[PDB]
Amino acid sequence: HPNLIVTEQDVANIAASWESYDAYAEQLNADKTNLDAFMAEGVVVPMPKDAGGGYTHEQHKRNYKAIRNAGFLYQVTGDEKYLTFAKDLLLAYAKMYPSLGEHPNRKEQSPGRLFWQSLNEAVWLVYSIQGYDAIIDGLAAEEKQEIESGVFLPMAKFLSVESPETFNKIHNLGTWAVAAVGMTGYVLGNDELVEISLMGLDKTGKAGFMKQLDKLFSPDGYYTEGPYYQRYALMPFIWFAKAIETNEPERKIFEYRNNILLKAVYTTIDLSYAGYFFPINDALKDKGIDTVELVHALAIVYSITGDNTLLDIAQEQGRISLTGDGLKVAKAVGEGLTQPYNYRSILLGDGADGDQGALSIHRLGEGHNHMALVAKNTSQGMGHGHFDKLNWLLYDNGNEIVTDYGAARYLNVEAKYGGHYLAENNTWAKQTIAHNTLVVNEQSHFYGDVTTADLHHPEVLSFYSGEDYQLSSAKEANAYDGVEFVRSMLLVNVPSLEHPIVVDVLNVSADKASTFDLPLYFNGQIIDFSFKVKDNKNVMKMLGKRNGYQHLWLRNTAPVGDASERATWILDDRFYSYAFVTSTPSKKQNVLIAELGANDPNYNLRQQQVLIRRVEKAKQASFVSVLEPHGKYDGSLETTSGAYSNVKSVKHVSENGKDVVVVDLKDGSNVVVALSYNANSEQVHKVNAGEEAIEWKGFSSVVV
């Protein structure tokens, strides 16, 4: 001991070398200084009382980090003060834990004992058992017995056999539970705890860690719950794997399922823009690559692969894993081995076999400030999933441009419902109207029913990434009774323009006359609209009654017609123009400008504007649009150029289920986008857009 996340050899290597690596030394010294200050407050182990973000919650969190850190520092420095603090913390836990029942401030989640929910209990164990592992050397036999029988064994029992609803779950909560119990099993030498963690309570392998590895990740290493929870689950995945590798290397855990864990780490990195994870499904926007789960996971993967491109990410994180694996990273960075990380367009299959929809990431441009389009054609993602099939996000110039709200939650803010998911997470954040995708009859996809949503996935029709253009196309046939919709999203390189442009074609067909809404949640300040708004008569009323509409204020409506319209806004030093036209037999076409904040008496929702394109009493519609970054605004030097859109108009024609979009540019040139929806590479297609016949081969064509 230790022999889990760090080994005895690791400790020796760290002790001998840690001062020599600037990046490692900075991290350790900062952690040491913070722990010393925490130690000066004495041993503080309060009775559990508060919900998430409350004092006892955050104190017990400080304690588990201190236990792990004190354990580590005792091994590295030899200083008995760290042994004592970790020992006395654990002994205080050992005396208190057996008398604990359910937390008095529980909610709907499986309750903990130290914490309001059992998830945090598992995190406490994952950390605290590492501290214990590193502290065994300086403990008396009587102390080990008090500690094991007092906290660790009772906790491992509580989180496993006493919690089958969590321990057998194929979900990030299950991952945390099996890692906590599994790591405890390895340290305490309890074979039963290890086996049930790997193969489930009944040992058949229907649940447990191995099932999670086979079910929760696609072959590409995409985690079904989404980037934010991929990040979170990555810790118990990679740490339990580490514990398995150091104790039972014969299991070859990092080779399992064609190196799935290695792929999971790379994919986590790939699910970010400018260092922040795509906020799809339940997610917070301030979560980025320096999160500790990815810091530790990167170090482990670098140690295995020697991929010097991971060092670029390591520098961007500005943090180092205080482990043997982290030592290797620090050493490599110091030697100048860093190579740039390759951010590229990727298609990420969803579902165990990668055939249950997909997440598309389209990247175009050089450097950090490139353009990134995300097409969310994924399966539901269970309880944290949003009702937003075929949703999209746009990033450009280091900014979110076309946005996803993420979750309604204030992390560890007790006054905000114990930092837990707020009432508005379900009533607003998950709802279709809160996203950039089709809403039919003011009802969410699958009528907001998670059970129904879990049974279906979008059909990916095409993915293409080239120098000329990029494309994702998908079909959603199951979101509504008697409704089918198809969406194709393109990034187009037009040599005469400063930046790539987005082209969006969303086709909908309905058995009955319906209302079709298509929102665009934008970031920035409106410059102007091409259309005329109706006077709002000095009142804003709630937009609609249900399914998220009750959270929006109607600021203006504006009637629109056959001709394309335009909204232009500014964000930082760049302008963005949204040119849009909808082909439909219905004349009932309006643009609704809305603002977030209705039915929000607790001030839980952010300020947010949205442009919603509405078609009423229609059985069919083609929502076509162009999103164009353009121009330069410099408030420092007080200059501007290219502030007007270069798109004169957008036109759309459909013939025999095939679409042609013509983007007329102000310089007299045009861009023609054609979609056949036929996968056959060699098949020829023809469409008559009034005058001029458009002819092409394949699923798609783009001609400037």
Q: By CB under 8 A, is residue 539 in contact with its own copies? A: yes
Q: Residue 280 Cβ, how far from Zn ion at the closest point, in Å?
A: 6
One-letter amino acid of 401: I
d(CA 189, CA 554): 63
Interface pattern 411-450 for its own copies (x via CB under 8 A): xxxxxx--x-------------------------------
Choose the stretch contacting its own copies; rule: CB under 8 A; options: 1-9, 66-74, 632-640, 654-662.
632-640
**Chosen from its own copies, Zn ion, none, partner binding at 598 (C-beta under 5 to 8 Å by type):** its own copies
Binding to Zn ion in span 395-434, by CB under 5 A: 404
**Chosen from Zn ion, its own copies, none, partner binding at 526 (C-beta under 5 to 8 Å by type):** its own copies
Binding to its own copies in span 548-577, by CB under 8 A: 550, 553, 555-556, 568, 570
| CB-based contact 404:278 (threshold 8 Å) | yes
Choose the stretch contacting Zn ion; rule: CB under 5 A; options: 303-311, 381-389, 614-622, 645-653.
381-389
Q: Which is nearer to its own copies, 215 or 644 (CB)?
A: 644
599: left (phi over 0), alpha (psi -120 to 50) or beta: left
Among 451, 607, 656, 681, the residue binding its own copies under the rule CB under 8 A is: 607
Active-site residue among 127, 186, 229, 266?
A: 229
Q: Residue 415 Cβ, how far from its own copies at the closest point, in Å?
A: 5
- Measure Cα distances from 682 to 37, 314, 379, 508 in Å: 70, 45, 31, 27
Collapsing DSSP states into helix, strand and coil, what is residue 125?
A: helix
Q: Residue 63 Cβ, how far from its own copies at the closest point, in Å?
A: 12
Q: Which is nearer to Zn ion, 143 or 442 (CB)?
A: 442
d(CA 407, CA 429): 6
Collapsing DSSP states into helix, strand and coil, what is residue 430?
A: coil
**Chosen from its own copies, Zn ion, none, partner binding at 404 (C-beta under 5 to 8 Å by type):** Zn ion
Active site residue 229: yes
Collapsing DSSP states into helix, strand and coil, what is residue 698?
A: coil
Among 99, 258, 342, 636, the residue binding its own copies under the rule CB under 8 A is: 636
DSSP letters spanning 218-259: -TT--BTT-HHHHHHHHHHHHHHHHHHHHH-GGG-TTTHHHH
Among 38, 256, 343, 633, the residue binding its own copies under the rule CB under 8 A is: 633
Q: Identify whether 2 is preceded by a cis peptide bond (ω within 30 of 0).
A: yes
Q: By CB under 8 A, is residue 641 in contact with its own copies? A: yes
Active site residue 384: yes
| CB-based contact 137:146 (threshold 8 Å) | no
Q: Which is nearer to its own copies, 633 or 677 (CB)?
A: 633
Q: Which is nearer to its own copies, 636 or 656 (CB)?
A: 636
Q: By CB under 8 A, is residue 538 in contact with its own copies? A: yes
Residues paired with residue 504 on neighbouring β-strands, in sequence order? 489, 625
d(CA 690, CA 687): 9
Q: Which is nearer to its own copies, 89 or 375 (CB)?
A: 89
CB atoms within 10 A of CB 224: 27
Residue 8 backbone phi and psi in degrees, to 5: -60, -40
How open is the CA angle 481-485-489, to the nearest 5 degrees? 155
Among 291, 377, 472, 622, the residue binding its own copies under the rule CB under 8 A is: 291
Q: Which is nearer to its own copies, 337 or 526 (CB)?
A: 526
Q: Residue 102 Cβ, how far from its own copies at the closest point, in Å?
A: 24
Active-site residue among 103, 296, 362, 384?
A: 384
Q: By CB under 8 A, is residue 286 in contact with its own copies? A: yes
686: left (phi over 0), alpha (psi -120 to 50) or beta: beta
Q: By CB under 5 A, is residue 386 in contact with Zn ion? A: yes
- Measure Cα distances from 92 to 84, 87, 96, 129 in Å: 12, 9, 6, 15
State the number of binding residues for its own copies (CB under 8 A).
58
Choose the stretch contacting its own copies; rule: CB under 8 A; options: 101-109, 190-198, 342-350, 605-613.
605-613
Minimal CB distance residue for Zn ion: 386
- Give every CB contact of residue 681 below 8 A, 6+ residues apart in sequence: 697, 698
| CB-based contact 388:376 (threshold 8 Å) | yes
Q: Residue 158 Cβ, how far from its own copies at the closest point, in Å?
A: 23
Q: Which is nearer to Zn ion, 263 or 386 (CB)?
A: 386
Q: Which is nearer to its own copies, 365 or 642 (CB)?
A: 642
Q: Which two tokens stand for residue 210?
A: 């191995």
Q: By CB under 8 A, is residue 292 in contact with its own copies? A: yes
**Chosen from Zn ion, its own copies, none, partner binding at 48 (C-beta under 5 to 8 Å by type):** none
DSSP letters spanning 557-582: EEE--SS-EEEEEEETTEEEEEEEEE
Q: How far is CA 574 from the centre of its chain?
A: 26
Q: Which two tokens stand for residue 406?
A: 């993420």
**Alpha helix positions (H), 18-104:** 22-39, 55-77, 80-96
Residues across the chain: 704
**Chosen from Zn ion, its own copies, none, partner binding at 643 (C-beta under 5 to 8 Å by type):** its own copies
Binding site for Zn ion (CB under 5 A): 386, 404
Binding site for its own copies (CB under 8 A): 53, 58, 61-62, 284, 286-288, 290-292, 410-416, 419, 525-529, 533, 535-536, 538-542, 550, 553, 555-556, 568, 570, 595, 597-599, 601-603, 606-607, 609, 633, 635-641, 643-644
List the catalytic residues: 229, 384
